């Protein structure tokens, strides 16, 4: 994935998720994409209530992009693999 200031454009299914989380722009940095993904998971309460590094994304649009039913924030590879598939590097 690109570095700090590099700009990216999310593909449509990812952009829709970011829009749910309040994003009004079409171009982001990777860190800004991660900000809105965290916002989305937080607002929808997809994290496990007891063990909050675990995210349950099955049956949610986010799981369709991640291709997994759950993931750990401390094992973020599925997130970054999804971003590689869903970001156009500008």
């Amino acid at each position: 994935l690109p570095g700090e200031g590099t700009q990216v454009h999310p593909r449509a299914p990812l952009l829709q998720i970011l829009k749910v989380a309040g994003a009004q722009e079409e171009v982001f940095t990777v860190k800004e994409v991660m900000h809105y993904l965290g916002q989305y998971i937080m607002m929808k309460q997809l994290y496990d209530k007891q063990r909050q590094h675990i995210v349950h994304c099955h049956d949610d649009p986010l799981g369709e992009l991640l291709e997994v039913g759950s993931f750990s924030v401390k094992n973020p590879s599925p997130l970054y693999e999804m971003l590689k598939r869903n970001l156009v590097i500008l």
Partner: peptide, 14 residues
């Protein structure tokens, strides 16, 4: 007992 907001922020900023 850390919150999702702090755990995600630690990753985002790393």
């Amino acid at each position: 007992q850390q919150t999702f907001x702090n755990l995600w922020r630690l990753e985002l900023q790393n």
